[PDB]
Amino acid sequence: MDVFLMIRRHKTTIFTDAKESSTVFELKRIVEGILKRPPDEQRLYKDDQLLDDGKTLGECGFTSQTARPQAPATVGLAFRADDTFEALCIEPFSSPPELPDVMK
Amino acid sequence: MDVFLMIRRHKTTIFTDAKESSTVFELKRIVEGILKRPPDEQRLYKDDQLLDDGKTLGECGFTSQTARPQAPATVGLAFRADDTFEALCIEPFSSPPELPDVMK
Amino acid sequence: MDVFLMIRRHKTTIFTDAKESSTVFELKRIVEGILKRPPDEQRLYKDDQLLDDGKTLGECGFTSQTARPQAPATVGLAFRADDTFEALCIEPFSSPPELPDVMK
Amino acid sequence: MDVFLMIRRHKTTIFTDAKESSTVFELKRIVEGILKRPPDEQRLYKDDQLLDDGKTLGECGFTSQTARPQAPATVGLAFRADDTFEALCIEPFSSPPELPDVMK
Amino acid sequence: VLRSVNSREPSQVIFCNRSPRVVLPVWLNFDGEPQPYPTLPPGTGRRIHSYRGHLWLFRDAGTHDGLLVNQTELFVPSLNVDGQPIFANITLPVYTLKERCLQVVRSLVKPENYRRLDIVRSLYEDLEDHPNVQKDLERLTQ
Amino acid sequence: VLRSVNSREPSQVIFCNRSPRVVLPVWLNFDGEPQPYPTLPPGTGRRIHSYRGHLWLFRDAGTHDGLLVNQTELFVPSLNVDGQPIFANITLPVYTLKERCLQVVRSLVKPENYRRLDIVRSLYEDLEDHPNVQKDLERLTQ
Amino acid sequence: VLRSVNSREPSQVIFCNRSPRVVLPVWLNFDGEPQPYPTLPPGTGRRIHSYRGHLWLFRDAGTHDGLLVNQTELFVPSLNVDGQPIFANITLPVYTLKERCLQVVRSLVKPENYRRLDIVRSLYEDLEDHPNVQKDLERLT
Amino acid sequence: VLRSVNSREPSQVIFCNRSPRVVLPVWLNFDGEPQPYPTLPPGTGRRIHSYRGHLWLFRDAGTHDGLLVNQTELFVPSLNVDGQPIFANITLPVYTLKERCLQVVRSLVKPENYRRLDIVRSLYEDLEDHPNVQKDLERLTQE
Amino acid sequence: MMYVKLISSDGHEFIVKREHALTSGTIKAMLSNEVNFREIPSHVLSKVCMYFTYKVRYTNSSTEIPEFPIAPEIALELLMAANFLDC
Amino acid sequence: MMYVKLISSDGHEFIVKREHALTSGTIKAMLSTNEVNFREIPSHVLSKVCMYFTYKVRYTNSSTEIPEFPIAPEIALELLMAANFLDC
Amino acid sequence: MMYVKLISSDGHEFIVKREHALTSGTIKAMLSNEVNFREIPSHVLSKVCMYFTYKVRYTNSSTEIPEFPIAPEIALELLMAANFLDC
Amino acid sequence: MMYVKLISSDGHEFIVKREHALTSGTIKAMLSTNEVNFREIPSHVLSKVCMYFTYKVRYTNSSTEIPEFPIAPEIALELLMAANFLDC
Ligand SMILES: Cc1cc(-c2scnc2C)ccc1[C@H](C)NC(=O)[C@@H]1C[C@@H](O)CN1C(=O)[C@@H](NC(=O)C1(F)CC1)C(C)(C)C
Ligand SMILES: Cc1cc(-c2scnc2C)ccc1[C@H](C)NC(=O)[C@@H]1C[C@@H](O)CN1C(=O)[C@@H](NC(=O)C1(F)CC1)C(C)(C)C
Ligand SMILES: Cc1cc(-c2scnc2C)ccc1[C@H](C)NC(=O)[C@@H]1C[C@@H](O)CN1C(=O)[C@@H](NC(=O)C1(F)CC1)C(C)(C)C
Ligand SMILES: Cc1cc(-c2scnc2C)ccc1[C@H](C)NC(=O)[C@@H]1C[C@@H](O)CN1C(=O)[C@@H](NC(=O)C1(F)CC1)C(C)(C)C
């Protein structure tokens, strides 16, 4: 099964897909190819929960029917500043304007 | 296995447990026993996604290793006042104070 | 005479034995009993060459004197993701550090 | 790498540290937490050069070996008066008196 | 040009709505004129009687947006082999993002208030170009 | 009262740390005195040599918080049947919510600023009475 | 206890080194004292002359690592029926992984630089307790 | 009190100057008396021969300002393991702002003109209280 | 089963199993099906209500018990609540 | 794989697979570079643009039931203006 | 046959036969079908499993036993691993 | 963390981390507010004082080579008096 994911750190957002059977570490290897940081220096989160490298994406609740191409699931990312990992920070997107009157 | 959940509507928060094999409709039946509202007048949500009556909680991404007793998963609740369902509104919890200097 | 093999896929490594007279199919059955995936969904490799189900292990160059218990031979494993077979991926083992000075 | 900074606007001088890998926007978020003004109304300068949100402090020439704790680098700040951004004004510090004769 | 053939040879067909929209079946009569038939709610199916060589297309009942049947635009009933009916699978096309945005806005803004939206004049003309079957038939006819 | 007996009868034991804490193994000598032994990082295991009738307990290496071994406070190596070593499963106890909050606060505030926290005087005395092995030993004796 | 009988009965033996290691044949004397004999290169074999009731053991010549002879620890020449020599097959024991790891490290670190290794101090005492013939003889006793 | 022990057991030491100052090495004799030894320019190193149990401290050669050796005040040659010499890392201490300010003023003003500066008498007495080793040695002896 | 409601200072209403709530004898006394807690905000009672689930689940358990998580910003207020509730 | 970066007006950086981005011939031309800046499309709009890339690549040429592409009303006009400029 | 899973610190998963693994009483104790070793990297745990096969094959064998090969670069970590497992 | 403001004689407002300012025992007393006025310390001195706070926190208890704290001669006397009053 394919799952569709948003990997978010600060104002960085990676759009990628993987398998429901794929593990957290293989997903970190994808982050490594893009952001050039080893899996050793990465921590991935589902909401605030730290994800274990060995667990599969299905196990962490990323399923084909909640991780959809048109509405992917969000995975938080945190890097290691020198010796300490940074806190998980995901900048929200811009907020949209008010509905116009003709659309209300 | 067992999943541990917070069912959230406005300022109402229900603490309960269920099975990964349980369906969304059976979860609505427990809300019926507690909040005295029939399942037809209930809509359950994972974040912004509507949960369908027939699907299992595991399928909808609620797993025992993400829906934990010490950190349950949040399921949104929306009622029908007569013929129209309200929008999802989960009142935020209180905000903690800032830390004493002796503690920082 | 027995040959001793490492069946490797991603970060998965299976240690098992067979005979030179055994076929590639029978080996795929061992894998099925371990990883619970049927032979039609498996591809086995010696280095980069795909192994044919009907050929015996002796034919494909796995001999009792190169596939040793204390140094087994590596057989690649590739699964079929839904309808397409995945590429052969074998994660290397960790790398040992530099030799300490007193051992140089 | 740690970089040590004086962010100055008028007669306001903020002493803080950041990472050489941190971005200009994250510095604007730090000014926001201190002076309670959002980044949209902020403009940061290295001398007269406008700093772009996405670039890192190292890219903008703030390095751990030029932005030192005992001699930090100066980053100018200019706020937005509703629709127009103000000019960059850093008020100088007081001037020392003449060296007494016994020190000449 | 685009016409049904009066073959008089019956053919049973399953109209099957595999879309989230209410489907309007449209039959092209012997003069080429589109005739709407009963609608099918989302996820429903109906067994109907038609004939070999007849032309049918399918649209959204509320907006007349084009829909696909067996991954194509036109469906022609064939001969029922071994009594098995011909299966017509009505599905959503992969719309362009522009058309999908137009659909959402058309559903939100009254037609009188299109020219009041803050957009380029080109998109006001695009909003008024509501999908209609007769126009598209002439495009294929040309 | 609580002491190891010199059996001079060997018994091999697996120390298995199934907790997120660094574990300090403490052996009570024949005089009853606690002796600290090599620490074990989380998720690690060690095969060690001990004796029938010896007494062992386990604490957090950094804070001396109480830990459980085979779901109780004390562990006594028994017979290695068929040479198989005895298994010591070191886990977290289910702390009371009050004790667990004290643990977090102790880890965040230096002892000098305990009396600077805005609390009732009882809670200040509670933060200063941080876990101590000798104290727990005399409590179990009573 | 462990000594050789002065039986004065000749008995011919085939010392066969089926091991990757250079072998030291050790004969126990009448006083029970170990006496080492000419080494045997790996894969070689020699027809030697000994006597009935004499006790022999075999080790790595360079390291004194214990080796098995005829599946066991000690060899005793027996009666030459019909002129056949008694055969002694010197083989590698199945060392425990620790002893083989101790072997490899010993072969790589000088005895003075054991204490400079980044390992628990117990292992420092293990690396020095390298195999010893008189040590093994006392063990059996 | 603070004295070197006549052990007669040699010990080779690296005197490594990781400071911007010229370093004066001072050996405390078996009688407790400070003895000055050859100086080391900034960033230089010297291999010397001392003995186990001997006491050493380090000062600025021009001002006698206190310096650190292996993050402490006193250095005692220990046993050379595997023949490797012991490393003495002479570095700048983090001076208080007042003491560092006094250093700059002493370096710019002749002592004769101390009482001419426009400051409180307390700061004049502090400028005249230039760093001195025996003073510091009696202070550590009190400790 | 039976359910009880615990109402916080800021008005949040928590629906918990009755058996879980009586863990605290303080709450048991306040019942002998609804309780108001001034002084206790919702960000503290949430974790209390979670502690109950954690305690009932991992109490007397052979399966590996996880840390109970308490964030630093709320540790002090939860301590006082735990002191008052005796849990 | 190959990835490209799309930066919105408010500074958000969206990294998508290159093949998904080649859906838009506009983007493909704007790349032939591994980066494109959009000074008029905010992040609440550009995020949905990337979702459309994924949805299109996934469901194009499918017999399986394709789901609707979801667009919130609050973003309908700004996505429309973005889609007209990119013609996707 | 029955198989056991041995997971190293870096996440590698080694699946060995239960009979081969019961060689180490340490492992047998750790079983009474998966064991995680957060101190043993994969370049070590791999030869550990190689040792399991070699021992089962050559125990009680008259045929010439070969040396168990150990590269110098890993000799120290396997020694530390072997001391704790006593195998 | 939390920041405090230190105001010089000339009106300049220096915002430093509170822990850094708490190094000076004199300032500690003046806070127990989030602001302090120094009617005798000009800006060219208080800024160098604030740099010294950063220098003290960064290099205290460090094995890495400590660099010199630089003081220009023209400010040495005024910094000296300020350091005497602030006891840092
Ligand atoms: C009434 C009806 C509703 C539905 C539908 S659709 C969605 N929900 C529902 C219930 C589906 C079929 C029907 C009727 C039974 N079926 C037709 O209307 C067929 C279809 C087309 O093929 C045209 N047609 C003829 O009957 C034509 N007659 C002929 O061609 C002949 F008599 C010469 C052979 C004409 C019209 C009389 C001109
Ligand atoms: C050094 C060591 C570290 C660890 C640990 S712990 C966590 N990581 C590691 C590596 C585990 C066992 C040991 C040593 C080998 N083992 C003991 O210390 C046993 C345990 C207890 O049972 C006491 N003990 C005796 O050996 C006692 N000996 C005796 O009682 C007799 F010889 C008369 C019978 C005394 C003490 C010598 C008095
Ligand atoms: C010199 C030699 C080297 C090798 C070996 S080994 C590996 N490569 C090579 C070439 C193999 C046999 C020999 C000589 C010919 N053989 C012995 O040394 C035997 C063996 C043991 O059984 C003791 N021994 C006696 O000759 C003893 N003599 C007697 O027992 C008597 F005279 C009373 C009967 C003593 C020692 C003289 C005390
Ligand atoms: C000449 C010299 C210069 C430097 C320095 S410093 C900065 N750049 C350089 C080149 C460093 C060591 C030395 C000489 C080789 N080294 C000593 O002077 C040692 C040091 C201390 O440990 C005292 N000392 C003894 O030799 C003492 N002798 C003894 O204690 C005994 F013979 C009884 C054992 C006395 C003094 C002769 C009494």
Author numbering:
A (entry chain G), B (entry chain D), C (entry chain J), D (entry chain A): 1 to 104
E (entry chain I), F (entry chain F): 62 to 203
G (entry chain L): 62 to 202
H (entry chain C): 62 to 204
I (entry chain E), K (entry chain K): 16 to 47, 58 to 112
J (entry chain H), L (entry chain B): 16 to 47, 57 to 112
What do the authors say?
The von Hippel–Lindau (VHL) protein is a tumor suppressor which functions as the substrate recognition component of the multi-subunit Cullin RING E3 ubiquitin ligase complex (CRL2VHL). HIF-1α hydroxylation triggers molecular recognition by VHL, leading to ubiquitination and subsequent degradation of HIF-1α via the proteasomal pathway. Small-molecule VHL binders can act as competitors to the native substrate HIF-1α and stabilize HIF-1α levels, upregulating genes involved in the hypoxic response, consequently affecting hypoxia signaling.
In general, these ligands adopted the typical binding mode expected for hydroxyproline-based VHL ligands, maintaining the key interaction network between the protein and the LHS of the ligand. Hence, the experimental dihedral angles around the phenylene connection to both the benzylic carbon (271°) and the thiazole carbon (60°) were very close to the calculated minima. Considering the results from this assay, compound 30 (Kd = 37 nM) constituted one of the most potent VHL ligands known so far. The most promising candidate, ligand 30, also caused a maximum enhancement of HIF-1α and HIF-1α-OH protein levels in both HeLa and HEK 293 cells. In compound 30, both features were realized to generate an exceptional VHL inhibitor capable of most potently increasing the intracellular level of HIF-1α.
